[PDB]
Design a protein around this ligand. Structure first.
Ligand SMILES: Cc1cc(C)nc(Nc2ccc(N)cc2)n1
Ligand SMILES: Cc1cc(C)nc(Nc2ccc(N)cc2)n1
Length: 282
């Protein structure tokens, strides 16, 4: 079926939970043996969210190459994304090592450091220009260059220096600051505006490594971001845009990382974002 009328048909019939459970039943199951090794217990934020072995990002290190991060490679759309958990106190150095080694230009952050009164990720970037951060375990230095605070999101320019080679690179930090503590946004308008700002920066484009996107577990809000981006790109590429099937795209992405889209409300919000976004494109 088309998307906008399949949407109203699920709303009128109140069957979002049944649709979402079908997706969960059909989703791929691949091994995640490296994630579960005992030496990696303090590299995982949640015991039930792990990268598959076949698509995990490897750190360029011979001691321990593990980070909870996955490469989502969308062949028809010609887009790639790295989805990862919010960094932990003992993985902030690994996180920036990955950004460096994978040649990423942008980092997309969809959570606040504290939500619901608990810590959802480490304060992994500097808050003041004159107070830089050094990661001694991976030999990187990180400096805040500038910060632009807007009503729904903040954009930061950061400098990452490999202290071994003295090479430097500019990284863009796109921080969506207004996702509610509970539920999903009422309107997708600010989320789409944010997506378009990331696109306009070059961070999603083939001349760079894959964008790094995270929330707390790296599957819920993070899944919504890449699902909406990929669906809209396919609608531009194809002769028949109504042939884009959001459930099939989500199942394709779940071949690369488990659990993408965590609730039926997030599924409905993804439909809404793609629907409204397709009107603005034209
Ligand atoms: C010398 C010194 C002393 C202190 C207290 N912080 C830093 N740098 C730093 C900046 C930002 C974060 N998040 C962490 C550390 N550096
Ligand atoms: C200069 C400086 C000063 C301080 C206090 N920390 C850092 N780096 C850092 C590394 C890992 C975590 N978690 C936090 C900070 N760097």
């Amino acid at each position: 079926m088309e998307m906008e009328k399949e949407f109203e048909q699920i709303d009128k019939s109140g069957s979002w939970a049944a649709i979402y459970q079908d997706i969960r039943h059909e989703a791929s199951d691949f091994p995640s043996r490296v994630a579960k090794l005992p030496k990696n217990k303090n590299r995982n934020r949640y015991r039930d969210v792990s990268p598959f072995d076949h698509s995990r990002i490897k750190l360029h290190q011979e001691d321990n190459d593990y980070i909870n991060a996955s490469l989502i490679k969308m062949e028809e759309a010609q887009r790639s994304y790295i989805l990862t958990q919010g960094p932990l106190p003992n993985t902030v150095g690994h996180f920036w090592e990955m950004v460096w080694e994978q040649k990423s230009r942008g980092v997309v952050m969809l959570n606040r450091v504290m939500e619901k009164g608990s810590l959802k990720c480490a304060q992994y970037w500097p808050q003041k220009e004159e107070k830089e951060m050094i990661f001694e375990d991976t030999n990187l230095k990180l400096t805040l260059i500038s910060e632009d605070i807007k009503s729904y999101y903040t954009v930061r320019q950061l400098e990452l220096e490999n202290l071994t080679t003295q090479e430097t690179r500019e990284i863009l930090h796109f921080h969506y600051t207004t996702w509610p503590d509970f539920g999903v946004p009422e309107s997708p308008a600010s989320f789409l505006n944010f997506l378009f700002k990331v696109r306009e920066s070059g961070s999603l484009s083939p001349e760079h490594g894959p964008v790094v996107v995270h929330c707390s577990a790296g599957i819920g809000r993070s899944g919504t971001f890449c699902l909406a981006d990929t669906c809209l790109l396919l609608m531009d590429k194809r002769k028949d845009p109504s042939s884009v099937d959001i459930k099939k795209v989500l199942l394709e992405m779940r071949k690369f990382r488990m659990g993408l889209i965590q609730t039926a409300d997030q599924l409905r919000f993804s439909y809404l974002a793609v629907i409204e976004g397709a009107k603005f494109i034209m």
